[PDB]
Amino acid sequence: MFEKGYVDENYIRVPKDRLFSFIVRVLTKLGVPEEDAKIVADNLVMADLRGVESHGVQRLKRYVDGIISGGVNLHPKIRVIREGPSYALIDGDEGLGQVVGYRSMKLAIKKAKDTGIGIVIARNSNHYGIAGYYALMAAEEGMIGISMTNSRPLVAPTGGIERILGTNPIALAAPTKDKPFLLDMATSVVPIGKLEWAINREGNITTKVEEVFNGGALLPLGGFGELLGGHKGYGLSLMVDILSGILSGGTWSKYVKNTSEKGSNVCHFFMVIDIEHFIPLEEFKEKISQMIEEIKSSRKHPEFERIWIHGEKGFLTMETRLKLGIPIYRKVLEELNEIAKRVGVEGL
Amino acid sequence: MFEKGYVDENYIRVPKDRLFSFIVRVLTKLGVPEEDAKIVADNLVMADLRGVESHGVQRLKRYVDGIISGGVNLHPKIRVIREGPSYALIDGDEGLGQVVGYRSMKLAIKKAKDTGIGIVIARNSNHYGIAGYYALMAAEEGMIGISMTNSRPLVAPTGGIERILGTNPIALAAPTKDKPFLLDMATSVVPIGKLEWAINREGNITTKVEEVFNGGALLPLGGFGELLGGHKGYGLSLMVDILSGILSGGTWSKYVKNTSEKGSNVCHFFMVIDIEHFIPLEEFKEKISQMIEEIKSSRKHPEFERIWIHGEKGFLTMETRLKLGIPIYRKVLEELNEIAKRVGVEGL
Ligand SMILES: NC(=O)C1=CN([C@@H]2O[C@H](COP(=O)(O)OP(=O)(O)OC[C@H]3O[C@@H](n4cnc5c(N)ncnc54)[C@H](OP(=O)(O)O)[C@@H]3O)[C@@H](O)[C@H]2O)C=CC1
Numbered sequence A, B: 001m002f003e004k005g006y007v008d009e010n011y012i013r014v015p016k017d018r019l020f021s022f023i024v025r026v027l028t029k030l031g032v033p034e035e036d037a038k039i040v041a042d043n044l045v046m047a048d049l050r051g052v053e054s055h056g057v058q059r060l061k062r063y064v065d066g067i068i069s070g071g072v073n074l075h076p077k078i079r080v081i082r083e084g085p086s087y088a089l090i091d092g093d094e095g096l097g098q099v100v101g102y103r104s105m106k107l108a109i110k111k112a113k114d115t116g117i118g119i120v121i122a123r124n125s126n127h128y129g130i131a132g133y134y135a136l137m138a139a140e141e142g143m144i145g146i147s148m149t150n151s152r153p154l155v156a157p158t159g160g161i162e163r164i165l166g167t168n169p170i171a172l173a174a175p176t177k178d179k180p181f182l183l184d185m186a187t188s189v190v191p192i193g194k195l196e197w198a199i200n201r202e203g204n205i206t207t208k209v210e211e212v213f214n215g216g217a218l219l220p221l222g223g224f225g226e227l228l229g230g231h232k233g234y235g236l237s238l239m240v241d242i243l244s245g246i247l248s249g250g251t252w253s254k255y256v257k258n259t260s261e262k263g264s265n266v267c268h269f270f271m272v273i274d275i276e277h278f279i280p281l282e283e284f285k286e287k288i289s290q291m292i293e294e295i296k297s298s299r300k301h302p303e304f305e306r307i308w309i310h311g312e313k314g315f316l317t318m319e320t321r322l323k324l325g326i327p328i329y330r331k332v333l334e335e336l337n338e339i340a341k342r343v344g345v346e347g348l
């Protein structure tokens, strides 16, 4: 069926349920409470299912190292710093990002349900995987969900060459008559996790392919200059840091550390709008689905086969891999079995 | 001094205060209440001062025609449809966009002040000028302001060629130790109002220069395809319509009519976050200004002179034109005097 990425011989199909239980085995063996392990697995598996290799199991080694080094708190006391009927400022106590984000989004949904609006911001957290995972939580509840997060410095501001801004993604999910609308994008042309594109910044600023890791930097949405809107992708990145890092009293991208480090201080932004408080949900669903249908049905470009709606490719890719299995690269699969050997659990 | 656009002989310096009083004369002569006329003038003049010609006085003829044709309600009964301590759904009753947006943002600021958060959405409104104008209102109050609006169909979705999406801008303003941070951008590479760029969509999809007006279409931030993130600018445009048009029970871009038409149904989104409810405002200002200083001071690209912060060029351009005067194109100035003659008031 349809699948977002290109899978060949260098890939091995792994039963979704198998990959999931594996992750849970490793995490619980390291002391992660079973329920928290299930949240992390759910988040990482969703990424693999939707075709986001960069944020799937390939990143399990990152969390494992963070747990072993004490850079990730196994029993975080996620505390509410400031709060109101429609908002809350949370301190993640260095817990897994998935756990901090899961609890933060659950609280935002609760507040929206009760007041119409829910805005929860968190600081002192860790990498939380795909932003769409949290936005979707609200959509599955019949509400609009928005999630953002800052990250390690990897992008250069317009007119500069240093890695100072994060890939800071933005995600919005809304319910429809069918599957939720789901926008989930890094504010840079591409995520660093992708490079296994367009973010061409070399030594002084060019491109290449491997000069990125060697003191290189990614480009913000819009591109290299100001001509094609590069300064806009740069602004969007700042919006994320202002709403996440600055407003929470946490920190911005430049100072976000790797997961293995204590005090990574990754910050997140969660916002939920209870559609029902505004207009009937069924009316909302009818109208948005009609918009989606009309957009898809609009005059296709000769070169193009189809006009997709955000989240569509991912849901189709998921559907496929659920009965066909999740394709995991060769070297990554080896990596996961080595992790299994190290911690002492059955591998894949 | 510094100025965002290029001004030559084809431009005439007009005292800011002079341009302002002119607009107010024309509008009040057409029956617009004096206070509402001052709001419109303030919004249009700010655009000219910040160097946004496309949304300044050059658009006075648009509002004039709408007023004369009944497409703009002179005495709108701006009504609250749904409301809560932290939100409100407003129906603009076809009033001037500036009036609807001004009252909507004032309400959002009030709710944020009292609860920490304020989200006001409006439907049945009209073109409201620059989005940054409303976001700035909140920043000048010591809060974070976010504003969005949908518009007439001018952009083609990724993989298509029809004008179906709006240029739907996004604006965020935050207070700093100095002048407010101000991001204000269309989600398309450029606004249609600019074409007097990068939005290359011709007859079937290419570029050119004049083929845009002739059945052409603008390109979404990211560009023509999917390779450089074109689908992201496309998603951002939808986010705006979902938060503005769909959620409000109004309508999305494809169905937004020109100002002169009754029922233009332009919709807006306003969001205010009272910083103080989260962290001390003075701490917020210190931290964001430190981030801005560090970004500007980062390693400059050889080709580039300076790294700007969003809103900086505009504020500098304004500063200049306030003591040097606002430069108005030749043909536009003629247009304004003709309007003055038609309505019967002193021109420029
Ligand atoms: N935790 C962190 O610090 C970071 C996490 N990330 C995450 O990594 C992932 C990488 O995202 P990124 O590469 O920027 O995004 P992509 O370019 O893959 O996708 C951008 C969005 O556009 C949609 N889309 C893709 N193609 C089309 C099309 N032809 N027409 C319409 N919509 C389309 C996608 O939906 P679909 O789902 O269908 O593909 C998606 O919502 C994200 O999930 C992001 O949240 C990124 C940076 C940092």
Ligand SMILES: NC(=O)C1=CN([C@@H]2O[C@H](COP(=O)(O)OP(=O)(O)OC[C@H]3O[C@@H](n4cnc5c(N)ncnc54)[C@H](OP(=O)(O)O)[C@@H]3O)[C@@H](O)[C@H]2O)C=CC1
Pocket (backbone or CB within 6 Å): A158, A159, A226, A231, A232, A234, A235, B004, B050, B052, B055, B127, B128, B129, B130, B131, B132, B149, B150, B151, B167, B168, B169, B170, B171, B182, B183, B184, B185, B186, B187, B189, B190, B191, B192, B307, B308, B309, B310, B311, B312, B313, B314, B315
């Ligand atoms: N009412 C409507 O229906 C619509 C209104 N609009 C409005 O029209 C205007 C057109 O905006 P648009 O052309 O997209 O935006 P620009 O590309 O001019 O500006 C994008 C943003 O980036 C900032 N910026 C510009 N150059 C740099 C740089 N080198 N480094 C860092 N930041 C930079 C700007 O600040 P600065 O202020 O300093 O220039 C601005 O906030 C906006 O004000 C928008 O709100 C657009 C579409 C529709």
